Design a protein around this ligand. Sequence first.
Ligand SMILES: CCCCCCCCCCCCCCCCCCCC(=O)O[C@H](COC(=O)CCCCCCCCCCCCCC)COP(=O)(O)OCCN
Ligand SMILES: CCC/C=C/C/C=C/CCCCCCCC(=O)O[C@H](COC(=O)CCCCCCCCCCCCCC)COP(=O)(O)OCCN
Ligand SMILES: CCCCCCCCCCCCCCCC(=O)OC[C@H](COP(=O)(O)O)OC(=O)CCCCCCCCCCCCCCC
Ligand SMILES: CCCCCCCCCCCCCCCC(=O)OC[C@H](COP(=O)(O)O)OC(=O)CCCCCCCCCCCCCCC
Lengths: 59, 316, 397, 220
Amino acid sequence: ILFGHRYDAEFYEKTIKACALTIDLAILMDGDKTLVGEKGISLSGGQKARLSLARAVYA
Amino acid sequence: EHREQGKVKWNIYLEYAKACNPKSVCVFILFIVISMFLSVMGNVWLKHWSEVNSRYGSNPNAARYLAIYFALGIGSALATLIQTIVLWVFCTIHASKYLHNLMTNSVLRAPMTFFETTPIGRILNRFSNDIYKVDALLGRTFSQFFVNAVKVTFTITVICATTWQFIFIIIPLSVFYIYYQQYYLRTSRELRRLDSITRSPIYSHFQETLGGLATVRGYSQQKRFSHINQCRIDNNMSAFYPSINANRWLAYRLELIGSIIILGAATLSVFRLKQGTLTAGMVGLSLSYALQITQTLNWIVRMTVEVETNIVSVER
Amino acid sequence: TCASILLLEALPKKPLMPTRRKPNPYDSANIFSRITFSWMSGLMKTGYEKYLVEADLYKLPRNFSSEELSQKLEKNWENELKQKSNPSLSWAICRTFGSKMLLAAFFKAIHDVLAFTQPQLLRILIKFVTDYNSERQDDHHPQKLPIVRGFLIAFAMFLVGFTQTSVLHQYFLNVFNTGMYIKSALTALIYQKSLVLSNEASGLSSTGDIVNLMSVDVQKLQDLTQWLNLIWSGPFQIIICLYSLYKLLGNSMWVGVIILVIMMPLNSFLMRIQKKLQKSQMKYKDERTRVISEILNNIKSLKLYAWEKPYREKLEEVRNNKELKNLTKLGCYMAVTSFQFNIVPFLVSCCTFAVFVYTEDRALTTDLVFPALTLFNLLSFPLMIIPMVLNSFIEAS
Amino acid sequence: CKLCRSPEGFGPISFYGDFTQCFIDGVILNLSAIFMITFGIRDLVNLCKKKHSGIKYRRNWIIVSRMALVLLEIAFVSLASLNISKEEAENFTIVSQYASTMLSLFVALALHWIEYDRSVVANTVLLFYWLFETFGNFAKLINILIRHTYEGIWYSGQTGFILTLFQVITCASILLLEALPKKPLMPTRRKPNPYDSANIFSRITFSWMSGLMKTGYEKY
Ligand SMILES: CCCCCCCCCCCCCCCCCCCC(=O)O[C@H](COC(=O)CCCCCCCCCCCCCC)COP(=O)(O)OCCN
Ligand SMILES: CCC/C=C/C/C=C/CCCCCCCC(=O)O[C@H](COC(=O)CCCCCCCCCCCCCC)COP(=O)(O)OCCN
Ligand SMILES: CCCCCCCCCCCCCCCC(=O)OC[C@H](COP(=O)(O)O)OC(=O)CCCCCCCCCCCCCCC
Ligand SMILES: CCCCCCCCCCCCCCCC(=O)OC[C@H](COP(=O)(O)O)OC(=O)CCCCCCCCCCCCCCC
């Protein structure tokens, strides 16, 4: 999500909630600290699209 | 904050030696010794023959000396052949058969809680790689270690037969050799592991970048992704630089040990000469072996490394 | 006094008065530690004590940064592309990194010279012992041989060995650094080129292929650098061997040279057999691993049916028959190649002594004999490895 | 009464200024060897009994060179013991010196091995043993060489001279490797005093004050 952009907690939380990612991030064993598996097989297609949107927005 | 190094797991070596029939292991060592004894006796015969050619101004009775020399050399060659055949047919194959049988019986008889507890990849890996290693690599490395250990024992024996005060030279150098061999046996494995660990991230990051190429260019994250690539590299090279200068370190010390062995053999042989009881044959033989000793010291050290690398497979 | 001053230069650290990983000691090591590689002693201790982790490794030396190397090679690559009608990446890399390979060539030249001096000191010491005894038996007239010469030949053997080692490992230091430079630079250039590569081009060349450029091809250039110096130091190390051995044995050396040459094709044939049969063994291993993989992934139902007995039988049939017959065959060809390596260094010398004895009226004396064994030992290596060098060179091309 | 068969008797100072051979072997090196036995055995026992395990000093090129050079000195002493002529074998001073010094060398080897792990300071009896040995052997070298230059003959053969010269070099090296090398250690208050971490040679030359002599020269 950060993709090299410096972390601001307020904006990051705002983007996580704006993407409605919060629900899908809660399912992660470590939330935003969960590592996505090799080649990205650890996440759903729509969830990955939402994550890409999150990166774009947090940029 | 760190994990101490561990002494060697000798029980693992004895379980492998019990896998191979230890009588067959004794036979295999016996034929290494016979191979080396016939080699060194071939050179002793060569020393005698050349001394004969030297006192008599020309080569007398050549066919006899040459036939016996050839006989001893072929005896060494056939001892090596029988040695390797025993190693494979009797020792290594029997051990691989026994270990795979034992592991399959145990794995199958394990309760399902075992399969639930452990990942399947961690079992498939042991059934593929840890078995292939004991199939081939481990037998070969024990061959190349015992052949060379016996070779060093016999070069030292022949040099000490020529000038017995060489044992006094080899004991201090034994201490240095063991120290160098111990340090290398551990840091070489560590640094080689670190090289193999840090290698993959370069290519994994590269596949990732090739997948995300258009997005990287889009956000113009090119400079950051390039810097990540260069950090992956420089990390790999910072693990590789030691992994190679470790060999340079080792080999330099062992070649000093070999040069000091040449100096000791030559000077003690010349002291024997001054005492009047040296013949050109003794110095030629002793010193030929002393010239060969350095590469066999290096073989021994590197085969200790390889044996330690491949014996954790028997452990697992 | 000079020994003391030399020690006070070499040993003493220079003191200094009043989470990152430390700078590399190759930068803080005087030429004597750069020669004896004794700056590695600290990392050799650390690894002997504790399990090393990426934080224990000293950072890279001054000029190892992939940034610096990539820019250094990129300047020359652009000069090649904008200057020559037929730009050649080979000459780009050469312009950039051939200085160290010339220096390593110098050290390899010295090392070969000394490697073939050692048999000459051996021949000289044997000849000296012969003469010294031949005089003392007469005694038991003026300017008779001194025993000192024996000790000075011994000390010259030590000096040759020691300087040989120093020059050899600076040769290795330089070629391996040049391999590291070439890989650290081509890896970064491959990355930065992919980042500007067109989409259609990157689609034409698969991603697997493009990452093999960096995973394989650059490793084969790096592996080339280790061997590139043998393209001349194999011929040099054979020429001076043949000359020494000719001046020693006469034209009876040619029998030994012929035997080694003709054992080279047989050696390569067996090497091909060995790799072929190892690959076949690996594929039988893959077969047994498929059997195991299905057994394990099906373990629940397998244990429910108690079908683990027949599946054990199937697994063990696969192993015992296919994999173990193949492995015993591999063991027998291992025996054949071990026999070859034991006998050929013998057979070369035995045959050349036979031809010497029956052709020359000279006496096959000790000083002819044992230097001949040493020289044939030295000659085996270049003949044994020129194949691997040319193989590496065509792969690198 | 008279345990020596040399015409130049136990007289501590010979006609030349040197110590006689009987004196060097009989009292200098013999008392050095007995000093090592008597006190190195004591220190060895105490260092074993003080603790089950060491303080984890890092085994080093220095400890391996001390052990190698001690074994080398054992080699030279054994070669000298064999170089004894039938005449010298009747010299009780010579034979006793060689037997006693071999026994002391074994004690010294054990004491190096234990000391390295167990003691912060380079051990006192080791340092003084190698300083008595480097001096007994250097005065034996001087004795042999003076006898050569004036009387024309080596009293142990030129090989005995060579062994003595190597003993001088070896013992000097071992003495330096005791004295100079710091013992390394592996992984706001003011620091502990170096008088506690200074071997008897630094306690004698007060060379533990050098650090504070530097600091005061640099800064107030
Ligand atoms: C900062 C600068 C200073 C720092 C130095 C600190 C440490 C000092 C070390 C230097 C010591 C200087 C010693 C001077 C050298 C003495 C040379 C003696 C040579 C000599 O006298 O000639 C021959 C002696 O014979 C012989 O063979 C005798 C050989 C041995 C002589 C005994 C000397 C003992 C003292 C030297 C040892 C010092 C080493 C200290 C570790 C006799 O010749 P001839 O003409 O009479 O022949 C006639 C035959 N009929
Ligand atoms: C100057 C020249 C000197 C010449 C010397 C002569 C040398 C002769 C050969 C010796 C060279 C290598 C010495 C090994 C040092 C060593 O052992 O040190 C060991 C490491 O040894 C090895 O890793 C490999 C030893 C292999 C032994 C094989 C045992 C039998 C196996 C049975 C299987 C055989 C059947 C195969 C078909 C570590 O110990 P430490 O961790 O406890 O460390 C304990 C410290 N706390
Ligand atoms: C012909 C006569 C010439 C006179 C003497 C010639 C010898 C040449 C002297 C070169 C000095 C060597 C360079 C080493 C630099 C260095 O140590 O540098 C000190 C290094 C530390 O690395 P640095 O160079 O970065 O400081 O020491 C170490 O940490 C490890 C030591 C190296 C391990 C090898 C052990 C060798 C043991 C030596 C045997 C001792 C016996 C002594 C009595 C006989
Ligand atoms: C009769 C022949 C005997 C053979 C040799 C006998 C000499 C006895 C050897 C004793 C060793 C001395 C103890 C010193 C301990 C120590 O240094 O210990 C090292 C000390 C540090 O203190 P520590 O003891 O606590 O470690 O070093 C220093 O910090 C300062 C050094 C002392 C300052 C004086 C400088 C003297 C310079 C010497 C001249 C060099 C010339 C060499 C070539 C000729």
